[PDB]
Design a binder for these strands. Sequence first.
DNA 1: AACTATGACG
DNA 2: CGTCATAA
Length: 430
Amino acid sequence: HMATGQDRVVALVDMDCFFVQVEQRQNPHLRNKPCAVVQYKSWKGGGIIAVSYEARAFGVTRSMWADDAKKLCPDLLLAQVRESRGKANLTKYREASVEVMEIMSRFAVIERASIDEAYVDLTSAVQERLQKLQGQPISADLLPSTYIEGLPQGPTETVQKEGMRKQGLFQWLDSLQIDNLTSPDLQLTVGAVIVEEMRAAIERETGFQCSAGISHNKVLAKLACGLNKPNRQTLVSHGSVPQLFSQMPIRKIRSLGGKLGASVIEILGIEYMGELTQFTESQLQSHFGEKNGSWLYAMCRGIEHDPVKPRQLPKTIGCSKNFPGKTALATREQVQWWLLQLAQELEERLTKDRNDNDRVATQLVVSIRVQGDKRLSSLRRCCALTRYDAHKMSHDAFTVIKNCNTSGIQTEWSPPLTMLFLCATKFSAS
DNA sequence: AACTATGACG
DNA sequence: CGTCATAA
Ligand SMILES: Nc1nc2c(ncn2[C@H]2C[C@H](O)[C@@H](COP(=O)(O)NP(=O)(O)OP(=O)(O)O)O2)c(=O)[nH]1
Ligand SMILES: [Mg+2]
Ligand SMILES: [Mg+2]
């Protein structure tokens, strides 16, 4: 079924207001209330990085200053991200993420895509389940939180959302050919049943709720996941794609949210994903390149082949700190102190990684930014990471960046640094 | 003065 | 290898 891109069953599971749930689980007083997670509190009340659905009802969003959020939502409750060594420490959320990833890993191969989401390749699990209870009809009861995108439709409770969900689910299940084990639609349905079980396990064992998308590829699975958030899952069939894409803004598709998506819209003079079908593969390749052109040609038809990579661990482990405006580091001692702070956090995380995952990083990347520099990185350099020693890593990091200081004065450092980034990479087994 | 992963290109 | 893109 590869020709039509119906060869696999892929899901994307994403936690609902993740950081907030983590804080709510720990502090019961925050449950079922407009709440948000904030980083730092000194500048404009701190930056919001997560928002409960109750808070979103007031217009509160990520990236908003807490002071501004309070203007929209006076009774907004806030949880502060932990600070260690003068910077944000996200260990609590990383540990919570592990809880969830470990549960998902029981059901199938997963690809960690973020701190709060992972792709699941359910093709094999579906096949196994299909042979079990073969020929047995699938009850609506097995899909208590599933939406079938595009349904209900046609002539024939619906004014309310749950009623709408049920009607669509009934139409879908009624039309399913259960006797053909090879049917893509049947395979998606079975995948949805498994995902219901996965999400139940996650909630029962962690207390966290999540949403999911089930489809034939990662892009459609990700898109589907967001259609009925929170605490719901959505199945997007191959057949639902034409109508779904007909009014779907191009920027909403994974990897098209940036410049490429903007160029597709501007160069082609179109707004929705579906409009891409009128162009030949060659035409798209001419405008956007061989790889991008082929990808777009297939994608607008609901077809994509990016595999769910069997990777549950990060390929890099890093620490970074910004020093905006007048806080830019202007002294040798300051720069050295901050490098040590980052190096110490990095050392802790690395040591844990080595113990937990039987591997060691072999390269240390040092990135900095100087004030007045438009570029994200004024300098990027590497050196060998031979030992998990904060002092050595900090000293080595300083050695590689020290020549960027142009100040004659011994004490002073210029131009001022607005960012420091230490990253461990090139992991090897041990 | 948003703050603290992966992948493709050349 | 370093940069730029995309992103939660
Ligand atoms: N520091 C920082 N953290 C972020 C940012 N974006 C997301 N996070 C962190 C905080 C988030 O809680 C977590 C998950 O990211 P999502 O899945 O994108 N959002 P959530 O789960 O919150 O809500 P829902 O999915 O229901 O819409 O990652 C950011 O720009 N900056
Ligand atoms: Mg989420
Ligand atoms: Mg997410």
